[PDB]
Design a protein around this nucleic acid. Structure first.
Lengths: 44, 103
RNA sequence: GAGUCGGCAAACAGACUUUGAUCCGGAGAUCUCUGAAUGGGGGAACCCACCUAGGAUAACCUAGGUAUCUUGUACUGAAUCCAUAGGUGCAAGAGGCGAACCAGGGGAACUGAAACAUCUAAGUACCCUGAGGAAAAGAAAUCAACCGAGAUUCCCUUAGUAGUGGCGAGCGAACGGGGAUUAGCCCUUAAGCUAUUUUAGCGGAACGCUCUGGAAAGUGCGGCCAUAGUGGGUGAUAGCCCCGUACGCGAAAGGAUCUUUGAAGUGAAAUCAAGUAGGACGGAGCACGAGAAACUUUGUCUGAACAUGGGGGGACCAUCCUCCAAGGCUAAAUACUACUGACUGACCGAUAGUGAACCAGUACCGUGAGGGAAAGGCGAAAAGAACCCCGGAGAGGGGAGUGAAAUAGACCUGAAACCGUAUGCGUACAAGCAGUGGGAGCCUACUUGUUAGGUGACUGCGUACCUUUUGUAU
RNA sequence: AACCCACUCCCGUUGAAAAGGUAGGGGAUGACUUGUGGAUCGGAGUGAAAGGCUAAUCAAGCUCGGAGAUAGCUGGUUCUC
RNA sequence: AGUUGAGAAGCUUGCUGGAGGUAUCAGAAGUGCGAAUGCUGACAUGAGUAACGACAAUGGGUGUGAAAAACACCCACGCCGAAAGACCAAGGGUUCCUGCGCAACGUUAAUCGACGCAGGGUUAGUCGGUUCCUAAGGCGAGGCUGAAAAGCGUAGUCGA
């Protein structure tokens, strides 16, 4: 039956994208923390 | 600058073939020297592809370390350390036993 | 200064020799799109543009400009007569990121108290805002007792002492001594001033025969160096084979640090103090939980004397002592390490040491924040197996060759559990923690039988180990 | 009848499936079903109300810090005489 | 394997191994495992046992090949046909097509493949996007409000 994940690219970018994280103040701290660990991606 | 150049004539100390008078062909960058005539190796190689041949066993020289050969003197006819004690326009390679410049 | 075209790794094509080719250091030029991202927008690495001066053919290209806020500065001018708001044009600055350090704003709970409300934990964790290479603090309305000491900051004692505390758990000073460091000055505002090292390099001393070995640095036998003899690495153990190790020279050019020096700030450099001191309720900070509670603070409400005054000396009062509050400025001793460089280890040696010696914050697991592994070693050197035979024209083997050695063959050593193949002896009428005491026979060796080893028919006694418990074969 | 839902029996339970299947059932022009896009969040939302749902987790999620929380309670504690 | 001590343990040798080892006596300890439903790799018993994923059926021939129940072609049977057929939207990301292969994968074998290596292959004034305009909703110069972060919102400019 209906599993709990139905994919879409327009909903993914507006919630978890870069311009969404960079807009707020918590999200810019999510960027610096995830960058300074050294991850390859930063924008899932 | 380096004791041993391409165009020399040396002798081999402390190897398979010690005392063999030789002459340097190729100097590698990991202090290993291909001396012309000594340290012979034989390579089982397949006959070459794409319109080539090799057949079988073909000799060549395997390099040896730079701390094994030395510059040969031809005035005592034995191995001699070299040096750069003459520098007036250029560092001249000079034997330390006789203070005479190499050629 | 003679080889070179980065690393994981072959065959092509070529550049310069004796110097500027690789290669190392200084300075410049280019520097696509994203990102504070800043011409307007966006789903980060995309779309649509204007303006100006030039060039270009019904289709464009160069070159700059074009964000908001602060300050200033022009021009401009609403209701409104004046003239402020407001609007444009220009100049200068800021914005973002970074491990810890410092000062402020806000500030928990678990837990202790063998429960728990005061109290502890604790003004600690965390969250914001500033600034600096340090910050803050500092030049007496301070402490001492009738003796005196003269800024602050930091370490050692006074002392776990006086105090404080459901007088419980606990929290805890100062005075005085010893040290480190050794300056004081005054108006942002009456009337202000606020010469050496460093990034590149270069020279750098002293050994010969003889054995064994695949290979000598080792066995022998002698000599030499020394301001450099416990380094690295070379076919095995090297002061004298190779790179290095003690001193000097520096350096076109930059950098920094002390100087002269330039401006300006670094700033040497004048007074002083009104809604101020005090007061009354309400809170904080003082070691100090309304306590006889001094003192500093400020949210509400009030309010002085003019340095003939003032305020301090732990309720309070008289006498003595000691300092000038309501304006400012300051080096040094001090705290810290994301980043370097040397060095050092009674530190680790691939289940240790970083999560990470290996292409690791990767693979993978998550819608996300986030979590997060496993993975080293052939040889001195690829000399990495030409050639033959079986096989699917393969996989895998059997030779042959290299090598000191292939049971070092794509890999040092190579154990245990687990699985096999040979050889010996015992087991198809015999009941159980599978062993122990006696013991026939057979086997293989040695003098040949106690010289020893391996099996064990038969037979007597025999209900594993740990933990909990008054006791467990249980 | 499509379509949405889940009343009964049997099979399945190491399932084909971390909730299905084959037979039968109820609504089926509306207090309907549904596609795309948005809004509401942790002592806080939503709820024709069952303490139900909020990413297979819910009498108060998930993750990182305080934090090696506290345990008069269980389990274990290694060579000889 | 032998041998020596009350014991922890010591000592001498046969083979493998191929470069390091430590009398003696003192120090410094990450100093000795069978057990924690201990932790991480290896290997067992169950056991060559259950299963091999819908009860829409396949049977011959010819071919290739080292080898055909499953591959290709042929002939004949079956099954869906308001889907087991065609096509747009999401989503995926080269799975499409052709040479070469078959160790691994595919619940068996494979000469076959959505599997390996090497090439190839998507053509727009009109079809969908972008460009123009807006709904819910978002952000929001100036502006009010707030310890700080920030909250709300006018002009405006994004959002099918």
């Amino acid at each position: 039956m209906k599993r709990t994940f139905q994919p879409s690219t327009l909903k993914r970018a507006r919630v978890h994208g870069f311009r969404a994280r960079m807009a707020t103040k918590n999200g810019r701290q999510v960027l610096s923390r995830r960058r300074a660990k050294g991850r390859k991606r930063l924008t899932v | 600058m380096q004791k041993i150049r391409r165009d020399d004539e040396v002798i081999v100390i402390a190897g398979k073939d010690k005392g063999k008078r030789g002459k340097v062909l190729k100097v590698l960058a990991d202090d290993r020297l291909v001396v012309g005539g000594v340290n012979l190796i034989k390579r089982h190689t397949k006959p070459n592809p794409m319109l080539g041949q090799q057949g079988g066993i073909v000799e060549k020289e395997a390099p040896l370390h730079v701390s094994n050969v030395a510059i040969f003197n031809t005035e005592t006819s034995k191995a001699d350390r070299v040096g750069f004690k003459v520098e007036d326009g250029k560092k001249i390679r000079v034997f330390k036993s006789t203070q005479k410049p190499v050629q």
